[PDB]
Amino acid sequence: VLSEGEWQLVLHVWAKVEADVAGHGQDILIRLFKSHPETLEKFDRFKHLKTEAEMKASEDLKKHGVTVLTALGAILKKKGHHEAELKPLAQSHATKHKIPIKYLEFISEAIIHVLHSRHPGDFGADAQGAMNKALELFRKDIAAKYKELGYQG
Numbered sequence: 001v002l003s004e005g006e007w008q009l010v011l012h013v014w015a016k017v018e019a020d021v022a023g024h025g026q027d028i029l030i031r032l033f034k035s036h037p038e039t040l041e042k043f044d045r046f047k048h049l050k051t052e053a054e055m056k057a058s059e060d061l062k063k064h065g066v067t068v069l070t071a072l073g074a075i076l077k078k079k080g081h082h083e084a085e086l087k088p089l090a091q092s093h094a095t096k097h098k099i100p101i102k103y104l105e106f107i108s109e110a111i112i113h114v115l116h117s118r119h120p121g122d123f124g125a126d127a128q129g130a131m132n133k134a135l136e137l138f139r140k141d142i143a144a145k146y147k148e149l150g151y152q153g
């Protein structure tokens with residue numbers, strides 16, 4: 001479990017995301033797609049995008065980044081008590097979208113990448129460690145739900 005102090009490090013940094021969810025979302029999805037291009041193929045609406053410029057200009061990709069970070073932010077704000085939030089997310093991502101845990105690791109890495117990039121003076125090792133622990137917990141719990149749902153992930 002994360003300590004309360006660890007959750008406060010997580011939520012202090014997420015409050016930065018909350019100032020500009022859309023812009024953080026764009027950065028995160030673009031980082032994901034550039035670092036792991038196979039992930040882009042999972043998105044039927046977005047897999048035609050050829051360049052970062054096209055990704056930045058996509059209003060629908062911007063909207064999707066808001067969708068993703070809105071969901072993740074609610075999960076983080078539960079401070080581990082996220083069972084209800086993970087049910088629909090796990091079901092769609094296991095059954096419909098077919099997103100392996102390794103791809104959830106990739107987007108976690110992108111989130112951390114972007115936080116470190118955007119917030120160079122207020123995202124140190126301890127804050128990054130706490131964010132990592134929160135994302136690890138999310139993935140652990142999603143993986144358990146994937147198994148319950150019948151997906152190997």
Ligand code: 6HE
Nearest residue numbers: 039042043067068071072088089092093097099103104107
């Ligand atoms: C590599 C692909 C990938 C990865 C890593 C994710 N997703 Fe997912 N995603 C999320 C939401 C709220 C929705 C719309 C409702 C739904 O269909 O469930 C989608 C839809 C989608 C859709 C339509 C697709 C293809 C999808 N998501 C691929 C996808 C949230 C997330 C979150 C919170 C994460 C991880 C932090 C995430 N996605 C990682």
